[PDB]
Amino acid sequence: YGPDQRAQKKGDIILGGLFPIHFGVAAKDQDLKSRPESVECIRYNFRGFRWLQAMIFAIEEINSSPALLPNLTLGYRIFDTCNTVSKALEATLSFVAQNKIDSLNLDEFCNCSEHIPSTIAVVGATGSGVSTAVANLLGLFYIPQVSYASSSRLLSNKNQFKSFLRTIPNDEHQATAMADIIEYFRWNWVGTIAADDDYGRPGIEKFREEAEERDICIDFSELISQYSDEEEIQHVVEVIQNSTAKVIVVFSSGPDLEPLIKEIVRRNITGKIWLASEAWASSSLIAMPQYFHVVGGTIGFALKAGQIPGFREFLKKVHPRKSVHNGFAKEFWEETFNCHLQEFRPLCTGDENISSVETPYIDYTHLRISYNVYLAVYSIAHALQDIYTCLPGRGLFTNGSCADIKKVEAWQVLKHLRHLNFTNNMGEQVTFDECGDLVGNYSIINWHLSPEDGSIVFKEVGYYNVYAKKGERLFINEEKILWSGFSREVPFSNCSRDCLAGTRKGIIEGEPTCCFECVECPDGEYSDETDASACNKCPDDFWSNENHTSCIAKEIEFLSWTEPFGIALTLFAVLGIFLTAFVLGVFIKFELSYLLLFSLLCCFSSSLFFIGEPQDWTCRLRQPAFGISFVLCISCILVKTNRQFLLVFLCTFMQIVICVIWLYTAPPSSYRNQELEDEIIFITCHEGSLMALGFLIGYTCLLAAICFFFAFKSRKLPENFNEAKFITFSMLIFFIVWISFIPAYASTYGKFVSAVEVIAILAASFGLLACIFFNKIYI
Amino acid sequence: YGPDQRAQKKGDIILGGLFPIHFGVAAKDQDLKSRPESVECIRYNFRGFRWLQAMIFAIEEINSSPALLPNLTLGYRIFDTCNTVSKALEATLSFVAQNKIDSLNLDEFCNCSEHIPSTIAVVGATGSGVSTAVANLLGLFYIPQVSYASSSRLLSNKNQFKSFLRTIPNDEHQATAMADIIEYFRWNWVGTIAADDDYGRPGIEKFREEAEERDICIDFSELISQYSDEEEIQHVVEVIQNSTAKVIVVFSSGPDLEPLIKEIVRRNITGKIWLASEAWASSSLIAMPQYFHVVGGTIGFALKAGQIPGFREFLKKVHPRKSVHNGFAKEFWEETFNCHLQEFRPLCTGDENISSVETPYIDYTHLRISYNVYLAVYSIAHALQDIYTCLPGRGLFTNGSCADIKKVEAWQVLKHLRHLNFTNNMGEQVTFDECGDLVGNYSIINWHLSPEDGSIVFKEVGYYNVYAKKGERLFINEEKILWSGFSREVPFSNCSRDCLAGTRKGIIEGEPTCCFECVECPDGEYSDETDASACNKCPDDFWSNENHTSCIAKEIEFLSWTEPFGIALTLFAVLGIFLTAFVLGVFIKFELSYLLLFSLLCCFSSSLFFIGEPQDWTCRLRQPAFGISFVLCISCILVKTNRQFLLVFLCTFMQIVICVIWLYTAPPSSYRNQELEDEIIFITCHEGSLMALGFLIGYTCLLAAICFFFAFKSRKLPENFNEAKFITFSMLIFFIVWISFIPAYASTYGKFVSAVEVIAILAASFGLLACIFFNKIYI
C-alpha cells in the first residue's frame, strides 16, 4: 500500500527495503492554496535500480538454494524513497502496520485477514539523513534495519538507534584517511566543503579535529546542499576564488555537489585539486567529460570491491512485461529507451536489447555498494538460519530457550543479528560490533580521461588498510597520479613558500600559522635549520657569515708574533744587539765601560721580549723596559767630567722598588677587549691607573732632564774628544724619541699599540749606543 | 491512547502537545533476552509541569473568553515525552491516526465513530533532537508544529521541515552574542564544550565560525552527552585541567551538563569561568549551592520575560482529585509531597498546601519559556480566528476562496499560520518569517549567591539587542559582575601575556597564534607599538635607545668648531699670528724682509681655516696649507750668504700648478664615513690617491733637504750674527715637526685627524718665526 510503485512478492517471511530509484523530488513548492498533494520525484538513478536488482537477486538465490532456509520462502515489499525523508517515511509507515497494536491498540484491522503480514527487517535507506529518520521509527518496534550505504558516525549511537546495523564502514576512518593523505603529500593549506546534512556535517568535524593534530590549518569551510539558491552558490564560489588553496576536501553526496560543479565549470575556475569523499568519488553525475576542465585528477575513495556470480546475467534478464514482481521495470525501460510503454515519445516495441545503450545500470567495473546490499540480505538470512537450527536448552534468550520459525518476532531476529558470525563467498568473516557495523579497507582511486571515447576511468592508486598500526595505514603508489588531469609533479598548496636558512620566520597579525613572512636575522644568526622559527645566537668564539648561515667564521687572532710586519723589527733588534756586542768586543780588547755597556746591551736585547701573543709573564715583563733603561742611563751621571761612582743604586733601586710597588697596582695579566665586531679578539695588558706613567716620568723623563741641567754648561765645552757635546746630542735624541712616542702610543690599540712602544725603545737604545760607541772607538 | 499518562479534554477542535515532565528514561539496558517492554522514565521536572500548566491555562482562558473563538471550544491531548525521541514518537504516532488514510488506506477504522478526532496543531517538543524527529513525521500530514523551546538552526530549513514554526529565537544570534561577549572583554583563548545532539553540535559550529573573524582562537572542543561513560567524562576533564583557558563556552542542555558538573565539583577544579548557553543558564540542576565552588559568576543568557496575569494563582488551584483532565497532577502531588496517593512513603491526606514546600513549580521570578508556550497556543488560536472571520472572495487559498470552521483541515491552518500578524497582551506584533520563527532580545544574567538561605539568584547584567546595527548589539553594565562568585576584576584569559614595547613577537612551531613568545630586537629597534609583530628599522639619522624604544637618539656631530679642545688651539694660532705681526712691525720700523715676512705670516694665519665643520670650500682649502708654506720656505734659498732673487716662482708656481692638477684628482668635497655604530656621523674630506702626499713631498720634504745640502758647509760657519746656524736650527726643527706629524696623522680619524695636521702646521710656522725674528731683532 501507500505508494503505488512497489516491488512486491509474497513469502512466509517478508523483508522490505528502501532504495533511491530517483534522485530527488520535483522542485515545485506548495503555496498551500489548494489541498496539498503528493510530490513527484524527478530524475532517474540507474545505479539505484541496479542496487534494487542486487537485493532481488540474492532473494531469488536464497529461495532457490535448499542448503539455506529449506521449506521456507522469503518475500519482499521493496519501496522507493526518492532520496527524501518524506518519501521514506511514507513507506516505513506502511512497514509498521501490523506492529501498530502496542501503543495504538485502536487498530482493529478490518482490512485484511493476514493483516498485511509483518516485515521482519528492512534493508537500507542509503541516505544518512534518511536512515536517521527511519531508524527513529523502527526502534519503537525493534525491527532490525540493515543499511547498506548510510555511513555516518551518528548512527553508531546505540542509546537512540537501538536497532541499526550496517554493512558499510563508519566515517571515522575516512576522515582520518583524508588527513593522512594531506600529511603524506605535505600540504598545510586546504579547504573544506561539506553537504549540509548528516553525512557531511559530522564527517567534516572529524576531519577538522583530526587535521589539527597534524597542523594542517584550514582556509575556509562552507556548507552546500542541493536545494540551495544562487546567492548561496555565488557566495561559495566567491570564497573559493577569493582564496589560494588548491587542495579542496569535499565531503558530500552525489547530487548535492551537482549545483556547485555546474556553476564552477560555468565560471571555469581551473586549478583546484579535489580530494573526494567516498560518496561522490565514483558518481555518474560528476564523472562527466564536459566537467573535466575543473574536475580532473581527483583523489577519491571507494569501498572494497565484491564478487557476485551470475548477477551480471541476472541484470540482463530484465523485462517490463516478464517481471511481474517489479513495478520499477516499466519506468526503467521507458527511461533507458525513451519509449512510451502502452498496456514526442514513440511507442515501445518491447523487444529491445539493453546492452545496446550505455547506462550506469550495466556499464560498470566493480560491485561496491551492490555487494553491501548482497551482504546485508545474506546476513538477514543467516540470522534467520541460526534461529532455524537452534536446539532447546541452547538458545540466546532467557534460560537458553530459543524460539520457533513460524511465529517469529523481530526482536528475536535483532538478537540473533547482534551475535552474528558467518562467512562470505569471498571467504571472509562477517561480524557486527557492539555498535553494529563492519570494518573494511578503502581503495583509493584517481579520475583519468580514457582517451578512446571513454568518459572517465577510475585508476586505483592505492589503499588504506585500517587494520594496520596507526601512522602506517596509507599506501599510495603515486606513479599513476595525474594532478589536474595531465600533470605529473605534485602541486604546491602551502600558504607561504618555505624560505631558506638565511632567515627566521615572522608572522602577520591575525592570520593562521601556516603562512608567515620571513625576515633575515642580523649579527650572529647561525640560522642552520631550513624553517627555523627563531635563528640562534652565535657563540663568543665566532661571528655570522655574509649570508647569515652557520657561523664558522671565528674571531681575531691579533698577536703579531711571526708576522712580516714585526719580523723586520725583530731583525732590527737583533742587529741592534749585535752592534752593541761588537762595540763591547772593541771596548774589551782595546765602571763606565762595564755598567754603561752591560745595561745598554740589556735595554736593547730585552726589548724583543714584548712582541707576540702576551700572557701573564710576558705582560708583567714590560717593567724591565723601564728598569734596564734606568740602569743604562747612569752614564749621564757617571761619565761626566765633574765626577762613589757605584752609587747608581740611589735611583736604580728606587725604580726597582717603584716597579715592585706597581706589580701589585698594575696587573701581571693581559686583558682582552671586544671593540670591533667580527675580528675583535685582542690582548692589551690593561695598565692599571698610572704605574707605567709614573715609572716613565720617574726614570726617563727625569734622567735626561737632570743631565741637561748639568751639561748646559758642558755643551759649549769640549772634553775627552767632545764627549760632552756627544752626550748632549744623545740626550736630545732620546728626548726626541720620547716626544715622538707619547701621543702615537696613547691614540692607538691592539697590534698597533705594542709596535710604537717597541719602536721607541729601539730608537732610544740605538741612539744612545750610536752617539757614544762610534765616537769613543774611531777617535 | 498509546501511553496511559495523558492530559485529555474534549472539544470541537483538539490541539495536542508534548512536554518534558520527566528528565530522561531509566538507565537500564535491554539484553533482549525477553520480549522488550516499555521503558520507564526516571527523574521529575517541575518546570516542565509548569509549562504544561501554562498550555492548559491559556486553553481555559480562550475557552472562557467569548471575544476569541465564540460558540466553539478547544480540546487537547497533551502527552509527555520523557525527553526522548522514542517517547516522543510513541505519542506523535497516536496524533496521526485519523490522518492515516492517505498512504495506508488500510486503516478501516473499526475502533471509534468519530475515529479519534484529528489534532490540528501540535505544540512543542522542547528538545531540538526531539522536534527534529517529530517534525519529520508531521510534515507528511502537514500538521503545523509550533515549538516553544527547540531553537536550533537546522529546523529553519523549509525544504525538509515543511510545517514547523517556533516562538523562540534561532541560535544564530546566541552564538554570535557569545563571540561578541569575548570580544568585549578581550580574551583570545577560550574552550568549547557542546552537548552531542542537535542543540549544541550545530550551535558550536556557528560559534567556531564567528569567533575566527575576531581571531579568538579556540583551545579545545569536546562533546558530552548525558549517556556518556566514565572514560569519556575522564577524558573531558583531563582536557579541561591539562589546558590553561579560564573562559569555557558551554553550549549544552540542562541534564547533559549534569554528569560533567558532578565530576568537576568532585575533583574541585576551581578557576574556570563559564559562559552559559541559553538552555542551562537558568537551570535547577546546575544552579545548586553545593556546586558553587566551581560554578559561580557564570555569564548566561535568557529570553525576554513575559507577563501572564492570573497564571500565578491558576498554578495554585491544582489538586490531584479536583483536576479530572490532568493525568500528571497525581504523580506531581506525590512527588512534591513524598506521599503515596491511594484510590517508606506515607499515605497522602490530599489537603496539603503547595506553597509550603519549595520547588521550581512555584518558586520562580520570570516567565520565560512559559510565555513562549502561551504565545504558541495564542498564535494557533488567532490563526483559527482569522479562518473564522474570513469572507468569500477574500481568502488566502485558490481564487480567494477561504474555507469553513466545522470541517477544517490542518494545511489550511498552516497556511493561515504562515501569514500571521497579531498583538500580545504586552502590545507587540508577532509575525513568523519565511522560515517561521520569532526574533527576540536576550537578557544577559549572572549567577549570584543570595546570602540569606537563598540558593542562587540570577542578577541581570545587560541585554543583547538583535535589532540594532552589527558591531553595536551588546550592552553590559559590568559593575555587577562577580567573576568566579566573589571577585571584581576581570580575569586574565589570554594564551601568552602581552609583553611590552621593547620586544617584537616571535612564535612557537606548531602552536596557535594567540600565544607566542617575545624576544628583544637589536640595533635599531624603535619598537613603538605595544604588541608589534616586527619592530621597525631606525632611520639613518638616529640610533635605538638602551631599552630599544623609539629612536630619538641621533647620530654624531663631530666637527669641533667652538669646542674647548680646539678653542685653545685657535687662541694659539691667533697669538702666533700676532707674534708674526709684531715682528713685522719691528722689521718695518727699524725681498727677504717682504716675502719671508708676508708668506710666513700667511702660513701661520690661514692655518685656522681648517678647524670646524667642513664643506666643499673648507675641504678644498687644505692645499693652501702647502702653498703658503712653500712660499714662506723661500727664505732658505733667498737669505743665504751665497746669493735674480725674485725667482721663487721656479718652485712656488710649480707647486701651484701641482695643486691645480690635484684639484681635479683629489676632490673639493668632504666625505662622511660610518665606522662606529651609535655616534658615527663624521666628515673626513677623502683625499683621493696621492695628491697631498705628492704636494708635501714636493714642497716641504724637498725645501728643507735642499737647504741642508747647501748649509752643511754653513752650519760650521758664522755669518750675519750666526744666521746660518739659526737657519740650520730652524730647518732641523721643521724636520722634527714633520717627522712627528706623519704616523700620528696616518693612524687617527675624524675629529682627531685634523687636529694633528693643524698642530704640525702651527709647530712649523711658530718655529720658523721664532728661530729667525728674535735673533734678527735682539742683535
Ligand SMILES: *[C@@H]1O[C@H](CO)[C@@H](O[C@@H]2O[C@H](CO)[C@@H](O[C@@H]3O[C@H](CO)[C@@H](O)[C@H](O)[C@H]3NC(C)=O)[C@H](O)[C@H]2NC(C)=O)[C@H](O)[C@H]1NC(C)=O
Ligand atoms: C608546506 O609546509 C609543510 C609544513 O607543515 C612542509 O612540511 C615539511 O616538509 C619537510 C620535508 O619536505 C619536513 O622535513 C622532514 O622533517 C623530519 C623531522 O621531523 C625529518 O625526519 C625528515 O627527514 C624531513 N624531510 C626531509 C625531506 O628532509 C618537515 O618536517 C615538514 N614540516 C612539518 C611541520 O612537518 C612542506 O614541505 C611544505 N610544502 C612545500 C611544497 O613547501
Ligand SMILES: *[C@@H]1O[C@H](CO)[C@@H](O[C@@H]2O[C@H](CO)[C@@H](O[C@@H]3O[C@H](CO)[C@@H](O)[C@H](O)[C@H]3NC(C)=O)[C@H](O)[C@H]2NC(C)=O)[C@H](O)[C@H]1NC(C)=O
Ligand atoms: C589578550 O589578547 C588580545 C589580543 O587579541 C588583547 O586585545 C587587545 O586589546 C587592546 C586594548 O587592551 C587593543 O588595543 C586597542 O586597539 C584599537 C585599534 O584597533 C584602539 O582603537 C584602542 O584604543 C586600543 N585600546 C586601548 C586601551 O589602547 C588591541 O587592539 C587588542 N588586540 C586585538 C588584536 O584586537 C587583550 O588586551 C589581551 N588581554 C590581556 C588581558 O592582555
Ligand SMILES: *[C@@H]1O[C@H](CO)[C@@H](O[C@@H]2O[C@H](CO)[C@@H](O)[C@H](O)[C@H]2NC(C)=O)[C@H](O)[C@H]1NC(C)=O
Ligand atoms: C586491508 O588492506 C590490506 C592492505 O592492502 C590487505 O592486506 C593484505 O592481505 C593479503 C591477503 O592476506 C596479503 O597478501 C597482503 O600482504 C596484505 N597486505 C598487507 C599486510 O600490507 C587486506 O586484504 C585488506 N582487507 C582486509 C579485510 O583486511
Ligand SMILES: *[C@@H]1O[C@H](CO)[C@@H](O[C@@H]2O[C@H](CO)[C@@H](O)[C@H](O)[C@H]2NC(C)=O)[C@H](O)[C@H]1NC(C)=O
Ligand atoms: C530589544 O532590546 C532593546 C535594547 O534593550 C530594547 O529597545 C528599547 O526599547 C525601549 C522601548 O521602545 C526604549 O525606551 C529603549 O530606548 C530601547 N533601547 C535602545 C533603543 O537601545 C527593546 O525593548 C528590546 N526588544 C524588542 C522586541 O525590540
Ligand SMILES: *[C@@H]1O[C@H](CO)[C@@H](O)[C@H](O)[C@H]1NC(C)=O
Ligand atoms: C572577494 O574579494 C573582493 C576584493 O576585495 C571583495 O570585494 C569580495 O567581497 C570578496 N568576496 C568574498 C566572498 O569574500
Ligand SMILES: *[C@@H]1O[C@H](CO)[C@@H](O)[C@H](O)[C@H]1NC(C)=O
Ligand atoms: C576554461 O579555461 C581553459 C584553460 O584556461 C580553456 O581551455 C577553456 O576553453 C576555458 N573555458 C571557458 C568556458 O572559458
Ligand SMILES: *[C@@H]1O[C@H](CO)[C@@H](O)[C@H](O)[C@H]1NC(C)=O
Ligand atoms: C527458565 O525458563 C522459563 C521459561 O523458559 C522462565 O520462565 C524462567 O524464568 C527461567 N528461569 C531461569 C532461572 O532462567
Ligand SMILES: *[C@@H]1O[C@H](CO)[C@@H](O)[C@H](O)[C@H]1NC(C)=O
Ligand atoms: C567468530 O568470530 C571470530 C572473530 O570475529 C572468529 O575468530 C571466529 O572464527 C568466528 N567463529 C567461527 C565459528 O567462525
Ligand SMILES: *[C@@H]1O[C@H](CO)[C@@H](O)[C@H](O)[C@H]1NC(C)=O
Ligand atoms: C595531561 O598531561 C599529562 C602530562 O604529560 C599527560 O600524561 C596526559 O596524557 C594529559 N592528558 C590529556 C587528556 O591530554
Ligand SMILES: *[C@@H]1O[C@H](CO)[C@@H](O)[C@H](O)[C@H]1NC(C)=O
Ligand atoms: C576545593 O577548593 C576550595 C578552595 O581551594 C576549598 O574551599 C574546598 O574545600 C575544596 N573542596 C574539596 C572537596 O577539596
Ligand SMILES: *[C@@H]1O[C@H](CO)[C@@H](O)[C@H](O)[C@H]1NC(C)=O
Ligand atoms: C476559481 O475558483 C474555483 C473554485 O473556488 C476553482 O475551481 C477555479 O480554478 C478558480 N479559478 C481561478 C482562475 O482562480
Ligand SMILES: *[C@@H]1O[C@H](CO)[C@@H](O)[C@H](O)[C@H]1NC(C)=O
Ligand atoms: C503586520 O506586520 C507588520 C510588520 O510585521 C506591521 O508593520 C503591521 O502593522 C502589521 N499589521 C497590522 C494590521 O498590525
Ligand SMILES: [Ca+2]
Ligand atoms: Ca550517486
Ligand SMILES: [Ca+2]
Ligand atoms: Ca583575522
Ligand SMILES: [Ca+2]
Ligand atoms: Ca532545565
Ligand SMILES: [Ca+2]
Ligand atoms: Ca600542533
